[PDB]
Structure formats: structure tokens, C-alpha cells
Design a protein that fits this description.
Chain C: GO terms for molecular function: enzyme regulator activity. The structure is cut from a larger assembly and holds chains A (849 residues), B (39 residues), C (353 residues) and D (116 residues). With 849 residues, chain A is mainly α. Chain A has 44 helices and eight strands. Chain A is globular and about 110 Å long. Chain D has a two-stranded antiparallel ribbon. The two termini of chain D are 52 Å apart. The chains are: A mainly alpha (849), B mainly alpha (39), C mainly alpha (353), D mainly alpha (116). Chain A binds chain D through residues 313-314, 316-325, 327-328, 351, 354-359, 539, 696, and chain D through 12-22, 24, 43, 46.
């Protein structure tokens, strides 16, 4: 085994002599390589000549040797220069291995280069050789008929041209198949790509591809206007909808977007729509007033209230301080949420008589929870207790302005303008206790009304409240500014507010502004990183606590590794107690995109010492896993219920219920034991106070909104996240700095129900639906498996578990336009023969209008 | 290539936990020293 | 289908294995067929992750027979057959990835390394070792010792007595059980004894007496004594006797290498400790060893570092240093650094387990 | 601890409830309760507390010097302690104690090599 005869000839000169060896050596490089490596300097010497033009053949032999050594960067370069002898379709052990490394190298380069430029692959900034190979590698994947290989590489290597061309060529007319492809790619770009500039371009392009087809799946078209937060896509879609007018379809589109899409996007789109001419039926739908009324009808019929249980719990014992009134007040609100039963409160009136001032403010804002989902009667019922129609005391009035914001969140265009007059009044007046509380509720209430929409007039009115330097009003005021300027916000707003925290000697205000900045950040990503440092660098606990949520909110939705990592850091290295809880609760939010990651993340934290850590992860689980119920979470929570520390017990009970909302045995066996416990603690006279809030309130969540509402981080109509649910949930984890803030859970209660709409009149009917709601593997909550056909009327209780399996029947004479969309959410079916009623039930929109 | 992405998700969870454990051993050790003095 | 296919592939590995050592039909005849199963229809099936579904045994048995030359004694005298096998195995080493196929990578290294050692260049070694160095979790204890042994022998040829010493000592640890305490242990032990002799001198022969085959030990004793006592005449006459030994072991090279050392060892015993030692005594001894290089040898010794001295040939005197109470400062520095290293490694081994 | 009697005028929400505390301040004004503790401090105060633990330079070094003078004796006593330790473990064939004794001897040697 010798290469020596051949190797010897390289050291001699004459081009003929060099040629005779080269080609002998070429065949057997892989075989003879040990000997050939020592002659490597000489082989490089052939290459560096350009008068002897069999340079490329030297290069190819040399590459083989370079691979075997482990200089991969060097081999790749020589392999390029070899040119017409590097063929990637031969596919040996040689060819495959250097090809791998080649894609690797472009990808690396393509990261660095995307950040600098957006055209680089068309230019001579990077290697044409590398490029050429990249373009063939792509041809190879599209030739093999797998599109998921073609796209995968093109994505990683930051080229827009390849993605575009690949979908296009392979776009076939069928329609059904295209749509599957475009959705598989939508999941993939969104959950993997955190570079906005790249991702946005793939998202926008996928709209344009569905658009090129004669029929196209409108639910997916709706999804993408939500995703990109872009007006342009939506307008073009709607002019298209004018040519193809089906009234059932056009209505289906508007009900999907109104629930799922951001509030501001919808508003500006209606402002443009009005001006071009649109149909006024549609313009009404896009406000979201009909949608909210459809749910009110649902909750009125399907209520499953159990008011005896709360009576029995209130009579169990009576003791010291304001925490336990907060507990009953909060459990009432959750129970009666959206159904509009003041039954408990109407009947039983003496316990209200025991209540002091802070408890009155808490109980009145529970009335706000009940009367949610009234679009005209919200104000009216509350009206004798609402300014200008003076009651007997202001403590009563203060939870009215707060609650009025709750009901009327998401329709608050008006509600802002009403409350701001109150804000101007009591910036002016400050010195008595009654006006301070009056304005504290007005300020929680204004921040709800102006939510998420920069109204700079509101920013100024609340800001004067700060200067008066009252701990009661200012806490609200500070939080209010955060809610309003959530999104991009002012540069000013951030800077003014951060500074004023460091100056303040008042506690309540610092905390209030701390949380206030976390909120301002919502999708602002790395551009908030600066304030995060400032906040953490404070030796103030309050700003550090808030600081964790500023990363939670800014990186919410698709996560980031650095972001999670920075929070793991904060939780570990800050021995101050409060700060540890905020950091662990914060983890939940980055990781809301897939709830599955959370039990793993927090497994270490669950055995981690400090009760503030263990409690905080309970709440986080609560938030994160409540989308479908997660069995792996409930298990983690179980030990934590039987924790000896009073507050870890509390959080576990509350957290359990948030996952286990609208669930039963055979879906979760464990819920019976859990229910026993919640009861057992209250009835007892031997437990501690903190635990006892947890038990009463836990019950209130499980059984909340007449057993018809769930806690999800989304509003279901396409399954894409909505603003309100998130914000609401960050506010709800807080009970500790001011007792009623629980109430924000009201925004994150979503009804789960299939709601049909007869499109010929735009009003709800009833039809059977083929379904799997059988009592052979399911139940509903009253004090898995599918094989048998089952039917039921519309506007009925529908679990997450049951939601999976909905279908529809076409022989009540209604046929769905988009069929089922996989999930709960308002639809519109077309009535084939419209000449008569074959079902047309009552709706509460026909009792308002 | 689509595959690779699936494998990255499982990888990414491991890297984050693995780094977190290091930070934990180091805090636990100081806390162990002080607490022994406290008992 | 999964279960059926694996079962066949395992079945074949057993069948070939059973069919050698104790159930073959002639080892040389069978080689073709072994080569046929490997190259098409086997590497092709594997997804580059095999460690246990191919084994050292197949390549070991085939190659062992080509080097036996008494159940073979070629089938082509052109040397086509054996050259081709060396190429095919060399080609496989490319195929065993630099991130996967890790146990199988190492088995290839041992076989290739042997063939170069018997008869070839052993600077061809240099590449294989660099390639070998990557994270391993799967290379077994037997293979490790084999590694160490080939590696020591090469370094011994190149003249590093020290490197080969550490490796050889490491070799005879771990692997030796009852199936590696057999012929392999004997090869290793020969080299380990030799190495100690060349670097310096070998420990006592007492230990080796009960830990090895006695048949080997008697020829090894004879060889060590001649070197230690230092007489040239002893060394040649001994070398002459155990020609058969040095040939089997592949250590005919010892004869060249050990010779310088013998002559050196014969001056060294003699303790030239006095202020002057007369020239005559040293010339007297050397005459038997060396017929024309009596002055050259005494000079050679001084340059080497065997004795620090002065000679004048006018006055015909050797003046020397005290060869007794040497070993002073910084000799502890060397010991102190080296012994701490040994301690850290053992503590590390405690932490792991 | 930090205390205050019943004193009202804001403590009227303080000591399923609320009947209790209204009657508690109505049946008796002035009964103790504990209050919560926090410590707020200032960064210059904070830095002063940590710089307790060039005089500093002089001291560490001083001990180092005098340790080196005396080491001839310090050597001898620690072999004797060590000799004892080895012997104890033989009989013994507790463990924590034997280990700690060896650990102290090793720690001290490293510090001593370091000193020069």
C-alpha cells in the first residue's frame, strides 16, 4: 500500500509528468490517504499556479485529504475551486460530507449578512460559488418532491428568493393542498423566526400566494392580517370580497377577525372602510358589539350557578382583617361572570353590612364582573353609584368607576372620554379621604378604557395625579398610564415614568410605576432591553419586581433563549423574596406559545428552595397550561398543595382550578380530591388565613361564569392571541399591594361554545351538530374516547376536550361556508332555501335594538 | 431540515436547564454555610 | 419488519463468528465471502451509527490469516490480495464518521497500525492518531490496551523512551481479565520490559515472575541481566541464543538499539567518585569492548552526561565528580509537580463515581 | 418588633369576616398588635458596611511573614497529627471526623507553599 511512485512525480516538473500522476492519485485518494497527507504542501503548490490549469484537479485531491485531517473550512474552499469536478449528484462519502459542511458555512455567513443587508445573495459580497451550490441543492430538494426539505434550508440561510420560488413553482391547481402547505409554513415561520424583518416578508408572501388562487381558505387569510398587524393585507382581501359576494362568507370573515385581531387594528381598518364604502351590516360586526351580545345569550341559557355553596362557606367562620372579605367578593364575581345574576347579593344582604370601606370598593367592583357582557345596561345599573348621581359615600363610587372599565373594556372609545372628566376634577381636588378613593377607582377604570391605545390626553390628565403625592390615587394612576401606552408608546413616557419612581418617597406609587413600565413593553422585543437593566440595577425591590415582567411582556408570544435565561438569572441571584416570585411568574409568559415547555422548565424551581419561588411557579403554570388542561402540570402542583407554608398552599389551590376549569372525572380523575380540600380548609377553624383565601377563591374559579367560561390566553376564533387576556392575567397574579386586582380575570374568561348564525338575517338559530359529547367518556361538571355518533342543539356547553371533534349536519337546511375550523368561535352558516323559518331563536341583541 | 427544527426544540430546553443548574449549585452552597451557622 | 430485519443482521454476525476459530472451513477461503457481505449490502443498509452491529472479529480474523502465512503462504506472490485489504480497511476509516461510528473507528486504527509496524513506515502512524482524537464514550478496555501497545512500539522506534513508558504501563492496567491475560498480555509485557531497559534500567524480576508465562520469562531474564551487568560479550552471545524470540516478537530492532546502552552500563557500575581516578583502569576495561576507541568512548560518555569529567591526556588522568550524593534542589520540583498531577487525576476519578 | 395599640382613623380596616374587627375596636380601644418590618438604607452606608472586612494589606502580609519564620516547627507538629490520623483509621476498620482532620492539614500546606 504505497502512493510513493505517484507522489514522487509531483516533485519533478513538466506539466505532462504532473498530469500522469494526478489522475492516478485522484481515484484512490480516499484509499491511500495516510501517505498522501505528507505530500500536501506540494499538492497546494500545483493549485497556486494558474499557468498550469489543472489547478482544479490538484484542489479536488487536496480537499479529500483536508476533510480527513479535520480542516473542514479549508476543504470546502478547495472543493469550490475544483468546479467541474465537484459534482453533488454523485453522492459518495466524499461528496456528501463536504456538501453538508458547505450548506453549514453559507448558513453561518447568511446570519451575519442578513443583519447588515437584505440583498446579499444577489451580490458579490458573498461567494457566487457558494451560491451556485445553494441554488442546486435547492433544485435537488424540489426535484425529489419534498417541499419541507427545500424550505427548511432556505429559511435557515436567510434567502427570500428561494422560499418564493419554491412555493410558486409547486403551487398547484389542488386548492386544498396549497392551503395545507401554507399553514404548515405559517406555524414554522412564526415559532422559529424571531427576526421580525425576515419573518414579516415570509408572512406577507404567503398571503399573496393564497390570493393568486381562484378559491382560497378565508380563515387562513384572516389569520395572517392578525399576525403581521398590517392594514394593507386586510383592505385588498375586502375588495376581493366585494366581487365574490356571498353574504354568509363576508360575515364569517368579519366575526373571525373581530375577536382574534388587535383592537387598534380593527379600528383603523373600520376608519378606512367607512371612507371607501362598505356594507353597514359588516361595520357593526367589526365593533364587536353583536359578538359580545351572542355570548351574553349563551351564558344566560347555560348558567349553572350554585349559590348555596357560597352561603355555607360564608357561615363557616368569621374573623379578623380585610383579606377574607376579598376572598368571598372575588369568588362571587368569578361565579356570576357574564351570566348576569346578582342573585347571591340580592338575597343575602347582612354580610355587606359588616363590610368597612376597602371591602365596599372590592364588593362594588364585583358588580362590574357580573354585569360584564351588557353593552348598554352596564352603566345604567351602576348609574346611582356613578358620578353626577351621588350616593351616600365615595367608597361605594370608587369600585363603580373600576368595574365600568371592566364591562366596557374593548368598547372604551367612549368610556375614556367620560372618565377623563372625573380625572380633571379630582386632579384639582385632593385633601379629603373620600376624593382620593373616588379617583383611585377612576384611575384603574380609565386605564382599562384607554387600554392599549396611546391617548396622550389621558396620559396628561392621570400624570397631574402624581404630583399631588397621594399614595391612594397615584398607585392606580401610575398603573393606568402603563395600560394606556401598552404597545409601542412614547419614548417620553418610559423616561418620565422611570425617573419619577427613583425620586418618589411613597411606596405604593413606586410599585405602581414599576408595573406601569412592564406594561408599556408589549412586543417591543430587544428595544426594551435597556430599561430592563435600569430596573434590575435599582436596589429598589419594587422596580426589580416590575423589571422581570418587562422581559415577560416584551418577549411574550414567541420566546427567546436570552430572555428566559435572564429570568433564570434574576430568580437565582436575587435573594430578596419578592423579586424571586416575579421572576418565576415572568417565565410563564415568554413560554405561553407552547404550554408544554413549562413543567420541565419549572421542575428544578419546584424543588428549589424559597417558598416565594415555589408559589410563583404555581401561578405561572396556572396561566400557561389552562388552554386545554395539562395532566403533567396537575401532577407538579399536587405536592405543592400539601406544602406546610401557608401561601404555597393558597397558590396551588388557585392554580389547580385555572388549569382544571370546566373539567370532570374521566378527564381528570384528581379533581374530586381537590374539590374535597377546597371545602375542608374553610369549614375548619384550625387553618391559617392565607390558605383560606386560596380555598374560597379556588372554588370560584373552577365553577366560574356559570360553568361556561375557561381561562385561555387567546380568544378562540382562529386561536390567535388577543391583547386583553394577556394583560389581564399579569394584573390578576397581584393581590398583595392592594387587595382587589383579582377582578382583572374577567378579561381572560372566554366562553367555549359553537355559535351558529343564520346569515340571511345575521342572527343565531338552532341546528343539530354531529359531535362527540357522549356520556360514555365525558361529563360536564356537576355537583378521552370516541366511537358513537351523538347530536345536540346549538348554543350548548362545549369543553376543550369536546371542542376537538365538532362537525355539522346539513339537513337542518343550514350548511357551513367554511365547515368546521377546528375550534370554538362564532361561525356563519348559509340557509339554502330562504323563504321561511326552520329555526330562529331569541337573542339579546333583539331585546336591545 | 424541517426535522432539524424539531430536534432543536428538545435541544434548546436541555441547554437552558443545564446552565440553570450551575447557578443553583453555587447559591445553594452559600445558603448551606449560613443556615448551618443559624441552627 | 423491524424486528425481522435486525434479527437476520444479528444472525449473520453470529454465523460468520461461529464459522471461524472452531467451525471454519479454512480461514483464507472464507475471506472473499466476508468481503462480499461487508461492502455491498451491509454498509449500504447502516445509517452511520453502527458500533455493535459490526464488530472487530470479522476484520481481525480475515487479516490474522494473511499474516499467519502457514495456512496461507499467499495465493498471489504479487501481493495483490493483502494490499487490497489494507486499502479497503483504510477506505472504511473514512466511512467511520468523525462524530459517529466511534468504537468502529478505533478497531480500524489497531489493524492498520499493526500492518505498518510489521513491515512498513511507522511515521504513517502519525495521521491515524490525530484522526482518532475525538470524544469517545464507546471504545472498550481491550481496544485501549491494543492502542497503547502499537503506539508505544512506534514511539520506541522514533526514540522516545518516555512516551512509550507511560502508555505501556497504562496498557496493562484495565483490560487484563482472563481473555486478555493470555497472549496479548505476553506481547505487551515484552515491550514494557524492553522500554524500561532503554530509558534506564528495569525493575526487579521478582514481580514479573508470577504475573506472566514462565516460558517467556526465562529468555527475558537472560536479556535483562546482560544489559544490567554491562558486559558486551554477554550481550552478543545472549542475542545469538534468543534469535527465535526476537523474531516472533518483531523486535530484531533491539539488537541495534540496546547495544550502545550496554557499553554505557559497563562504565556506569564503576563508581568514579574520587578527585582523580586513573585513566588506566578505564582503558583496561574498554579494550575488550572496543579495539580502537578507548579515548573516544571516555569522551562519548562525558558529552552524554554519564559522568561529569575532565581528562588531560598529557597527564593521563581523569578528574571526576562524586557519583553518590547527587539528587539535590529542583529534583524535588520535578517530583512535586508530577506527583500533584497524579493526585488530581485520582480525585477527579472519585468525583465522577 | 414594632407595635402599636388600637388607634384607628385609618386602622379601621385592621385588627367570612368583618363583623369581628368592627366589634373588636368597638369593644375595646387599645390592644396590641405587631407591625411589619422592612429595612431601607442608603448606598454609601451600604459600601461602608462592606469595607469593614492598606492597613488590610499590612496585616495579611504581616501574618504571612511570621508564619514563614516559624514553619520549621509548624511542619513537625502537623506530621505528628497526621501520624495519629492514619493510625486511628486503621483501628476504625467516625469517618467525618477523620476526614476533617486530614482536610485541615492539606488546607494549611497549600496556604504555606503559596506564602513564599
Amino acid at each position: 500500500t504505497t502512493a510513493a511512485p505517484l507522489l514522487a512525480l509531483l516533485r519533478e516538473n513538466q506539466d505532462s509528468v504532473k498530469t500522469y500522476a494526478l489522475e492516478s492519485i485522484n481515484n484512490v485518494v480516499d484509499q491511500l490517504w495516510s501517505e498522501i497527507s505528507n505530500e500536501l504542501p506540494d499538492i497546494e503548490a500545483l493549485y497556486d499556479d494558474d499557468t498550469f490549469s489543472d489547478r482544479e484537479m490538484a484542489a479536488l485531491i487536496a480537499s479529500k485529504v483536508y476533510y480527513n485531517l479535520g480542516e473542514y473550512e479549508s476543504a470546502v474552499k478547495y472543493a469550490l475551486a475544483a468546479k467541474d469536478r465537484f459534482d453533488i449528484d454523485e453522492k459518495s462519502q466524499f461528496v456528501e460530507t463536504i456538501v453538508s459542511k458547505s450548506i453549514e458555512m453559507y448558513v453561518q455567513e447568511a446570519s451575519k449578512q442578513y443583519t447588515k443587508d437584505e440583498q446579499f445573495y444577489t451580490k458579490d459580497i458573498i461567494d457566487p460559488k457558494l451560491t451556485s451550490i445553494f441554488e442546486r441543492m435547492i433544485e435537488k430538494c424540489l426535484k425529489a418532491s419534498e417541499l419541507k426539505l427545500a424550505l427548511g434550508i432556505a429559511l435557515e440561510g436567510y434567502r427570500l428568493d428561494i422560499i418564493e420560488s419554491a412555493l410558486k413553482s409547486k403551487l398547484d391547481q389542488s386548492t386544498s393542498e396549497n392551503v395545507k402547505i401554507i399553514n404548515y409554513l405559517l406555524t414554522l415561520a412564526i415559532t422559529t423566526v424571531t427576526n421580525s424583518k425576515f419573518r414579516s416578508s415570509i408572512l406577507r408572501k404567503s398571503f399573496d400566494f393564497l390570493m393568486n388562487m381562484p378559491n382560497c381558505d378565508y380563515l387562513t387569510l384572516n389569520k395572517v392580517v392578525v399576525n403581521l398587524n398590517d392594514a394593507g393585507l386586510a383592505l385588498q382581501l375586502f375588495k376581493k370580497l366585494k366581487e365574490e359576494n356571498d353574504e354568509g362568507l363576508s360575515a364569517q370573515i368579519a366575526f373571525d377577525l373581530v375577536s382574534s385581531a388587535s383592537q387598534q387594528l380593527l379600528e383603523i381598518l373600520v376608519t378606512e372602510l367607512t371612507a371607501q364604502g362598505y356594507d353597514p351590516a359588516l361595520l357593526n360586526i367589526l365593533s364587536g358589539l353583536p359578538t359580545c351580545d351572542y355570548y351574553n345569550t349563551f351564558l344566560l341559557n347555560n348558567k349553572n350557578i350554585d349559590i348555596g355553596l357560597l352561603n355555607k362557606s360564608k357561615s363557616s367562620l368569621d374573623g379578623k382583617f380585610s383579606l377574607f372579605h376579598t376572598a368571598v367578593s372575588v369568588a362571587n364575581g368569578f361565579m356570576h361572570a357574564g351570566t348576569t345574576d346578582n342573585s347571591f347579593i340580592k338575597a343575602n344582604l347582612p354580610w355587606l353590612g359588616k363590610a368597612q370601606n376597602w371591602a365596599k370598593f372590592t364588593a362594588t367592583a364585583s358588580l362590574g364582573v357580573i354585569h360584564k357582557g351588557n353593552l348598554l345596561e352596564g352603566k345604567k345599573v351602576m348609574a346611582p353609584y356613578l358620578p353626577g348621581s351621588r350616593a351616600s359615600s365615595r367608597f361605594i363610587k370608587g369600585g363603580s368607576l373600576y368595574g365600568l372599565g371592566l364591562i366596557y373594556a374593548g368598547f372604551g372609545r367612549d368610556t375614556t372620554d367620560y372618565l377623563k372628566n372625573i380625572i380633571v376634577e379630582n386632579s384639582g381636588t385632593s385633601g379629603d379621604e373620600d376624593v382620593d378613593v373616588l379617583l383611585h377607582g377612576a384611575s384603574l377604570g380609565i386605564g382599562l378604557a384607554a387600554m392599549g391605545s396611546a391617548n396622550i390626553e389621558v396620559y396628561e390628565a392621570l400624570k397631574e395625579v402624581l404630583y399631588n403625592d397621594s399614595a391612594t390615587s397615584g398607585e392606580a394612576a401610575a398603573l393606568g398610564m402603563g395600560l394606556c401606552m401598552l404597545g409601542t408608546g412614547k419614548p417620553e413616557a418610559i423616561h418620565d415614568m422611570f425617573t419619577y419612581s427613583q425620586e418618589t418617597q411613597h411606596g405604593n406609587i413606586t410599585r405602581g410605576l414599576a408595573v406601569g413600565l412592564a406594561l408599556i413593553n408589549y412586543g417591543r422585543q430587544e428595544l426594551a432591553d435597556d430599561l430592563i437593566t435600569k430596573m434590575l440595577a435599582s436596589d429598589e425591590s419594587l422596580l426589580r419586581y416590575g423589571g422581570a415582567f418587562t422581559i415577560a411582556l416584551a418577549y411574550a408570544g414567541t420566546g427567546n433563549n436570552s430572555a428566559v435565561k435572564r429570568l433564570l438569572h434574576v430568580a437565582v441571584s436575587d435573594s430578596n423574596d419578592d423579586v424571586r416570585r416575579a421572576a418565576v411568574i415572568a417565565l410563564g409568559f415568554v413560554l405561553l406559545r407552547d404550554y408544554t415547555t413549562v413543567p420541565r422548565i419549572v421542575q428544578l424551581l419546584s424543588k428549589s428552595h424559597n417558598a416565594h419561588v415555589r408559589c410563583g411557579t404555581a401561578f405561572a403554570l396556572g396561566i400557561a397550561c389552562a388552554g386545554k388542561g395539562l395532566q403533567s402540570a396537575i401532577d407538579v402542583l399536587d405536592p405543592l398543595t400539601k406544602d406546610p407554608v401557608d401561601f404555597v398552599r393558597q397558590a396551588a389551590m388557585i392554580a389547580l382550578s385555572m388549569i382544571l376549569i370546566q373539567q370532570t372525572e374521566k378527564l381528570n380523575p384528581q379533581v374530586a380530591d381537590i374539590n374535597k380540600n377546597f371545602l375542608s380548609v374553610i369549614t375548619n377553624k384550625h387553618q391559617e388565613g392565607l390558605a383560606k383565601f386560596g380555598a374560597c377563591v379556588a372554588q370560584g374559579i373552577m365553577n366560574a361564569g356559570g360553568r361556561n367560561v375557561t381561562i385561555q390566553l387567546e380568544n378562540a376564533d382562529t386561536g390567535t392571541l388577543d391583547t386583553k387576556s394577556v394583560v389581564g392575567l399579569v394584573m390578576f397574579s397581584q393581590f398583595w399591594y392592594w387587595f382587589p386586582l383579582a377582578h382583572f380575570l374577567s378579561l381572560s374568561f372566554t366562553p367555549t361554545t359553537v355559535i351558529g348564525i343564520r346569515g340571511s338575517d345575521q342572527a343565531i338559530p338552532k341546528f343539530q351538530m354531529n359531535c362527540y359529547a357522549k356520556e360514555d367518556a365525558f361529563s360536564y361538571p356537576r355537583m378521552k374516547y370516541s366511537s358513537k355518533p351523538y347530536k345536540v342543539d346549538n348554543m350548548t356547553r362545549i369543553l376543550p376536550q369536546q371542542s376537538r371533534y365538532i362537525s355539522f349536519i346539513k339537513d337542518d337546511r343550514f350548511v357551513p361556508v367554511r365547515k368546521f375550523k377546528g375550534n370554538n368561535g362564532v361561525v356563519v352558516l348559509r340557509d339554502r332555501e330562504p323563504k321561511e323559518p326552520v329555526a330562529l331563536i331569541e337573542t339579546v341583541r333583539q331585546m336591545k335594538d | 431540515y424541517f426535522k432539524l427544527k424539531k430536534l432543536e426544540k428538545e435541544y434548546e430546553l436541555l441547554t437552558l436547564q443545564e446552565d440553570y443548574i450551575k447557578d443553583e449549585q453555587r447559591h445553594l452552597k452559600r445558603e448551606l454555610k449560613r443556615a448551618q451557622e443559624e441552627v | 419488519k423491524t424486528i425481522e430485519v435486525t434479527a437476520e443482521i444479528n444472525c449473520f454476525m453470529h454465523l460468520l463468528v461461529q464459522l471461524f476459530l472452531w467451525d471454519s472451513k479454512e480461514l483464507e477461503q472464507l475471506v472473499e465471502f466476508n468481503r462480499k457481505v461487508v461492502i455491498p449490502n451491509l454498509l449500504c443498509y447502516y445509517n452511520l451509527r453502527s458500533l455493535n452491529l459490526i464488530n472487530a472479529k470479522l476484520w481481525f480474523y480475515i487479516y490474522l490469516s494473511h499474516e499467519t502465512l502457514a495456512r496461507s503462504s499467499e495465493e498471489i506472490n504479487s501481493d495483490n490480495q493483502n494490499i487490497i485489504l489494507r486499502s479497503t480497511m483504510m477506505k472504511f476509516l473514512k466511512i467511520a464518521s468523525l462524530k459517529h461510528d466511534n468504537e468502529t473507528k478505533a478497531m480500524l486504527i489497531n489493524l492498520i497500525l499493526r500492518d505498518f509496524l510489521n513491515n512498513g513506515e511507522v511515521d504513517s502512524a502519525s495521521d491515524f492518531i490525530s484522526k482518532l482524537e475525538y470524544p469517545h464514550t464507546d471504545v472498550s478496555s481491550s481496544l485501549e490496551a491494543r492502542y497503547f501497545f502499537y503506539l508505544s512500539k512506534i514511539n520506541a522506534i522514533q526514540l522516545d523512551y518516555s512516551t512509550a513508558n507511560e502508555y505501556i504501563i497504562a496498557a496493562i492496567r484495565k483490560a487484563p481479565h482472563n481473555s486478555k491475560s493470555l497472549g496479548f498480555l505476553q506481547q505487551s509485557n515484552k515491550l514494557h520490559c524492553c522500554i524500561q531497559l532503554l530509558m534506564g534500567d528495569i525493575p526487579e524480576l521478582s514481580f514479573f515472575h508470577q504475573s506472566n508465562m514462565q516460558k517467556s520469562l526465562l529468555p527475558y531474564y537472560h536479556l535483562t541481566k546482560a544489559v544490567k551487568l554491562g558486559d558486551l560479550k554477554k550481550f552478543t552471545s545472549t542475542i545469538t541464543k534468543y534469535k527465535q524470540l526476537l523474531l516472533k516478537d518483531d523486535t530484531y530492532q533491539l539488537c541495534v538499539r540496546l547495544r550502545s546502552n550496554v557499553i554505557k552500563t559497563g562504565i556506569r557500575i564503576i563508581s568514579l567518585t574520587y578527585k582523580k581516578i586513573s585513566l588506566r583502569d578505564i582503558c583496561l576495561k574498554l579494550n575488550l569492548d572496543s579495539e580502537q576507541t578507548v579515548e573516544y568512548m571516555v569522551s562519548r560518555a562525558i558529552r552524554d552526561g554519564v559522568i561529569e569529567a575532565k581528562i588531560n591526556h598529557e597527564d593521563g588522568f581523569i578528574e571526576t565528580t562524586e557519583l553518590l550524593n547527587i539528587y539535590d534542589s529542583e529534583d524535588p520540583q520535578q517530583v512535586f509537580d508530577e506527583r500533584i498531577k497524579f493526585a488530581n487525576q485520582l480525585h477527579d476519578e472519585y468525583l465522577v463515581s | 418588633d414594632a407595635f402599636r395599640l388600637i388607634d384607628t382613623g385609618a386602622l379601621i380596616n385592621n385588627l367570612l369576616n368583618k363583623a369581628n374587627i368592627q366589634a373588636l375596636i368597638h369593644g375595646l380601644n387599645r390592644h396590641y398588635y405587631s407591625l411589619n418590618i422592612d429595612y431601607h438604607k442608603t448606598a454609601k452606608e451600604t459600601k461602608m458596611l462592606m469595607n469593614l472586612h492598606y492597613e488590610e494589606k499590612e496585616e495579611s502580609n504581616l501574618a504571612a511573614t511570621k508564619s514563614m519564620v516559624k514553619i520549621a516547627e509548624q511542619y513537625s507538629k502537623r506530621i505528628e497529627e497526621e501520624k495519629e490520623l492514619t493510625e486511628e483509621e486503621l483501628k476504625t476498620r467516625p469517618k467525618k471526623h477523620l476526614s476533617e482532620t486530614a482536610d485541615e492539614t492539606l488546607e494549611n500546606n497549600i496556604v504555606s507553599v503559596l506564602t513564599a
